């Protein structure tokens, strides 16, 4: 189902989504998740008595980085994650990132865009999705307890692993850990499929859910985003393994507030 | 001509039909035929006084099994005979076969489908039609006279002979006989084309048309189907040569009447 | 954009042009340039008093011929060039090359469709535009002064000379010549572009723009048509390297007056 069409991409597989000053297009798209059923209302923090720095332009829209290389090798459920706000956070993120820092809180919502082209005679197929709470880490910390980087964007790919017991962490055993996560359930999440077959793009916008109506992007990372492979890439004997993955995203309507002078710190 | 479309399989090239307890789909159709231009009506035999078994649902659905294997071997016009209703028999036959030899007579039509699906780098053309009054057989009696194995299905492919004179039989020679056949014009008979190019299937449906309104099922079978191929499959070395061709067929409204206990006999 | 489609070649890309008693089709069609904007009105020379011979059918369809070869050798902006009416004049060109040269003037214009279709794992891109005045010739003469063959229809392809200096011609040096082209704007003529990847067919249609409202087809030649090549042919072996190319052209309501009796040489 979606209109006539294909070895080529075609029609009502043609999108197109224009934000600020950077506009964005795809051949051959399935749809796009506005996960949970709402956008985001740059409905003012309610929080703060700071009539905070709204609808600015500049950074609003899609910043594009690379995420990793998917490859024969990798083994099922294996993942990646990216966490937002934490990796549009300097530099690499914009006027975002900039006033990003120059503000205690920030109050937005995400709309990505994941890619991943490949050719008709590959075989594959890559899960993505958002959820908030969840982990990252990089580590079991040096020498003294708990727990090494959240905010690190996974340099490489980590090992699913024969069992949650959501790798807890000082030396021990014997049971699990409230970091658990059952990669056999990570598909209730706002999620999207990218089938070689069916996908050369996957695109995902998601609202705003903390604890609080706003939040502190110094301690927290409200939603963590997923590029983890479930049906790896098998390639015959010619053909372009290489298979490059690359994801662009766009904060929508951020609500700053709490303004004041450049944080200090990243290692 | 037909919708919008293809490497893949599409849209107005997608049907499906529902039957009984057993539901049908195809991803790259051209059509249906409903031979002749009348279906079914389970209009009762005005021949009997019987106010026989009708609507049941239980027999009135898809039964499928396998015919023979397609291979880059095969010579034109070779043919594969399936005689309805003599396959659909029992055992293999569900509740129409059993309800089917605890009565003396019958009336259905046919609704069939014949599948096999190859590759875009696969060349061939196989040719499906539907014929009342035709041949089968399987052989040239033992020592005497007249004709092998109509109800068996043919286990394995016959040889386009050069000539009708159709299989006469008992030594012999000069002339012809009445079961002759021109694979020559063998396109006069509801038919449908496969073309691994076009097709990946094949629906026919037909009427019921013998010299009585309902017949007996034990010495006639009113209409033999034939998968017999017109231009063989070449394949370039690489490629699945394994072409499986399968068939699934279903009696339409069938009208029993005339009933006794269990006939007994098939070597 | 066009519509819904393909590996295979579909429906709003399937046209066909019925023209006398030779008619059309193409089932991988992109458009058909009416070049200018305006056709040709069978609009009666004012220039003559002769009441001249209209509407004949007879010369008023599709000639179609052979053009070249095109290979993996061939260098981007190399050229072929048509010259009409002198190509359809005789012979090889019907009734109306015949009815062309026993009469002194002819006003036409010409409705041309290229063709060249080869097969997916296929890159490369021709490029087909009209030009009325345009260059042919095949030569720098012999032994006096001026300029080899315009009628004769380059027999194989010329070289894009790193520098129009427009072929000027007896023996000379030190700057260029009024048969200048920049094959580097070459794109300001009515043109269409053939992709091997998009296009497997090119129709363009021409009006009539010469110097005087009929003009004399033994001296001038009104419109040269040019089938030179802008992004070669590569083929990975296993892969049809012969891409023939073939054109078929249509005179569009001729309208010749000032009648006489068979022109006389062509070397």
Redesign the interface.
């Given at each position: 189902d979606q209109?006539?069409?294909?070895?080529?991409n075609?029609?009502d597989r043609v999108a197109s989504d224009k934000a600020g000053n950077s506009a964005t297009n795809t051949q051959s798209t399935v749809g796009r998740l506005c996960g949970y059923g709402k956008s985001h209302h740059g409905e003012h923090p309610a929080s703060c008595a700071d009539t905070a720095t709204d609808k600015v332009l500049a950074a609003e829209r899609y910043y594009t980085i690379d995420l990793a290389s998917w490859t024969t090798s990798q083994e099922a459920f294996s993942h990646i994650r990216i966490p937002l706000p934490h990796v549009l956070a300097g530099e690499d993120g914009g006027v975002f990132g900039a006033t990003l820092r120059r503000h205690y809180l920030c109050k937005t919502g995400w709309r990505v865009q994941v890619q991943c082209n490949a050719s008709?005679f590959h075989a594959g197929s890559l899960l993505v999705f958002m959820a908030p709470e969840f982990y990252t880490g990089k580590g079991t910390k040096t020498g003294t307890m708990e727990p090494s980087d959240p905010f690190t964007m996974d340099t490489e790919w980590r090992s699913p692993q024969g069992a949650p017991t959501g790798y807890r962490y000082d030396s021990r055993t014997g049971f699990f850990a409230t970091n658990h996560q059952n990669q056999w359930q990570w598909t209730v999440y706002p999620h999207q499929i990218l089938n070689l077959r069916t996908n050369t793009t996957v695109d995902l916008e998601v609202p705003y859910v903390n604890v609080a109506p706003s939040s502190s992007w110094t301690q927290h990372a409200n939603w963590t985003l997923v590029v983890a492979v479930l049906s790896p890439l098998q390639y015959a004997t010619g053909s372009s393994p290489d298979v490059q993955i690359t994801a662009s995203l766009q904060p929508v309507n951020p609500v700053f507030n709490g303004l004041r002078h450049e944080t200090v710190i990243a290692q």
């Amino acid at each position: 189902d979606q209109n006539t069409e294909e070895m080529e991409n075609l029609s009502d597989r043609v999108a197109s989504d224009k934000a600020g000053n950077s506009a964005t297009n795809t051949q051959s798209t399935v749809g796009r998740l506005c996960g949970y059923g709402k956008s985001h209302h740059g409905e003012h923090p309610a929080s703060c008595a700071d009539t905070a720095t709204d609808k600015v332009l500049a950074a609003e829209r899609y910043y594009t980085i690379d995420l990793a290389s998917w490859t024969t090798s990798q083994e099922a459920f294996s993942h990646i994650r990216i966490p937002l706000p934490h990796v549009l956070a300097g530099e690499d993120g914009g006027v975002f990132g900039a006033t990003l820092r120059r503000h205690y809180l920030c109050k937005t919502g995400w709309r990505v865009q994941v890619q991943c082209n490949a050719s008709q005679f590959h075989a594959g197929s890559l899960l993505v999705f958002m959820a908030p709470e969840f982990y990252t880490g990089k580590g079991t910390k040096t020498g003294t307890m708990e727990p090494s980087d959240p905010f690190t964007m996974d340099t490489e790919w980590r090992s699913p692993q024969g069992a949650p017991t959501g790798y807890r962490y000082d030396s021990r055993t014997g049971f699990f850990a409230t970091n658990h996560q059952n990669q056999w359930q990570w598909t209730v999440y706002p999620h999207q499929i990218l089938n070689l077959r069916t996908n050369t793009t996957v695109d995902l916008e998601v609202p705003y859910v903390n604890v609080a109506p706003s939040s502190s992007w110094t301690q927290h990372a409200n939603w963590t985003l997923v590029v983890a492979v479930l049906s790896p890439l098998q390639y015959a004997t010619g053909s372009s393994p290489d298979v490059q993955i690359t994801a662009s995203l766009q904060p929508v309507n951020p609500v700053f507030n709490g303004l004041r002078h450049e944080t200090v710190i990243a290692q």
